Structure formats: C-alpha cells, structure tokens
Amino acid sequence: VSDISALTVGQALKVKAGQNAMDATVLEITKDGVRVQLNSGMSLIVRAEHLVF
Known part of the structure; x- marks a missing residue:
C-alpha cells in the first residue's frame, strides 16, 4: 500500500540490462x-536511483 519503498x-x-531498458x-x-525479475531472465533490479517505474 502506497508502495513499499519507492514501489x-x-x-x-x-x-536496464546493457545500456538499454529491458523490463x-x-x-x-x-x-x-528493488529486486525485480529481469525480462532478460534475471532478478536483481538495483537501487532507486536506477529504476524508472
């Protein structure tokens, strides 16, 4: 609710997996x-200053 942290x-x-976004x-x-699930097939995301939700 109201997002956990920033989401x-x-x-x-x-x-962004290799200069380009990915999802x-x-x-x-x-x-x-976050620790997202990469559309590349990984899981990690990054820190808030790198996510573009």
Missing part, C-alpha cells in the same frame, strides 16, 4: 530500489 512487489519496471518485475524490494 511495490509485482509493480514491474526497468532494470523487470518486482519480486522483492530494497531500501528504495
């Missing part, structure tokens, strides 16, 4: 970033 789980946003789906969230 919520299952929010889904960008990770990744939130599995868990961090201090302000």
Whole structure:
C-alpha cells in the first residue's frame, strides 16, 4: 500500500540490462530500489536511483 519503498512487489519496471531498458518485475524490494525479475531472465533490479517505474 502506497508502495513499499519507492514501489511495490509485482509493480514491474526497468532494470536496464546493457545500456538499454529491458523490463523487470518486482519480486522483492530494497531500501528504495528493488529486486525485480529481469525480462532478460534475471532478478536483481538495483537501487532507486536506477529504476524508472
């Protein structure tokens, strides 16, 4: 509710995998970033200053 940190789980946003965006789906969230599921097929996202939800 009101997003966990900067977003919520299952929010889904960008990770940017190799200079280009990719898309990744939130599995868990961090201090302000997340640990998403990469559309590349990974899971990680990054910190809030790197996500573009």
